[PDB]
From Swiss-Prot:
Function per UniProt: Transfers electrons from cytochrome c551 to cytochrome oxidase.
Name the record gives this protein: Azurin
CDD domains hit by this protein: Azurin
Principal cellular location given in the protein's record: periplasm
Protein origin, superkingdom: Bacteria
Positions with a binding annotation for Cu cation: H46, C112, H117, M121
Disulfide bond residue pairs: C3-C26
NCBIfam families linked: azurin (TIGR02695)
Pfam families in the record: Copper-bind
Amino acid sequence: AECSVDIQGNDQMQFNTNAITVDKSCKQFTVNLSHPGNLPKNVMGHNFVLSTAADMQGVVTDGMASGLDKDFLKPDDSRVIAQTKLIGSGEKDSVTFDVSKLKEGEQFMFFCTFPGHSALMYGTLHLK
Ligand SMILES: [Cu+2]
């Protein structure tokens, strides 16, 4: 029942962690993103986006082209397993998704799609 993680993106373009692990029993997993720090959504917005590792470049490249107004995510992108909204300083957003959308045999990556960020802002998610 610890079926969450709190994760932070800061003004230094880093997530607080590079690895999330999801337990054995969770019907659902929740990611509670916050942005400590001072920069607004246009300078240093962060979202938390989850996909297969192979799907990550697509989601990031298409997201950029989709623009700020769309939280830098292609709308109705079936590659996205979970997303939060894009957030800036002092904001928060949480996403819950079904653990079953985690296809056994896959490797998963989380990342921010704000332009440039995913060079630093990425990590792995493993089903445990
Ligand atoms: Cu970011």
